[PDB]
Design a protein around this ligand. Structure first.
Ligand code: HEM
Length: 153
């Protein structure tokens, strides 16, 4: 898992995100959808959005961005002792939404990208290292539940 020092870095960084969760949430989803258009098809809600400009102008998209980072923040705050919160999330993303673990990889990368874009020079080597590991742990725990359910993707 992560050391206490590492968890401290993750929650310090999360402080940056909480100052503007909708702004961070929206840019994450944009990065995802533009870098991997197939992911947009999973949302009936945003499949109409072709252009990035349209994406930028969607208040609905911003709303979902908020929903997503609120859920993620709640899990990160548990520092690994997140079974309770994570299982239900894993079960609906596999059975209901039908999201392959590769798309969780993609969003993980989108988060790191956004953190550097919005905090250039403010998101250092130790911080990036800790956040990367935290997102890997998150993905790994999801992968365990996906395996139980036999969801391939
Ligand atoms: C940081 C990773 C993610 C988090 C924390 C997250 C969280 C959530 C939450 C809290 C909801 C609403 C309740 C539910 O239906 O389960 C949701 C809905 C959904 N998620 Fe995710 N999600 C993540 C990644 C993804 C990815 C990568 C995709 C697809 C590329 C995706 C696809 C969807 C869809 C299609 C819905 C239904 C939304 C609607 O139309 O109302 N999720 N997600």
């Amino acid at each position: 898992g992560l050391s206490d020092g590492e968890w401290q870095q993750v929650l310090n960084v999360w402080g940056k995100v909480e100052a503007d969760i909708a702004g961070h949430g929206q840019e994450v989803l944009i990065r995802l959808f533009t870098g991997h258009p197939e992911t947009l098809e999973k949302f009936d809600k945003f499949k109409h959005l072709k252009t990035e400009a349209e994406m930028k102008a969607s208040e609905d998209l911003k709303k979902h961005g908020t929903v997503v980072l609120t859920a993620l923040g709640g899990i990160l705050k548990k520092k690994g002792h997140h079974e309770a919160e994570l299982k239900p999330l894993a079960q609906d993303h596999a059975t209901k939404h039908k999201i392959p673990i590769k798309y969780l990889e993609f969003i993980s990368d989108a988060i790191i990208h956004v953190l550097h874009s919005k905090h250039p020079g403010d998101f250092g080597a130790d911080a990036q290292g800790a956040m990367t590991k935290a997102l890997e742990l998150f993905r790994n725990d999801i992968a365990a539940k996906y395996k139980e359910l036999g969801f391939q993707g």
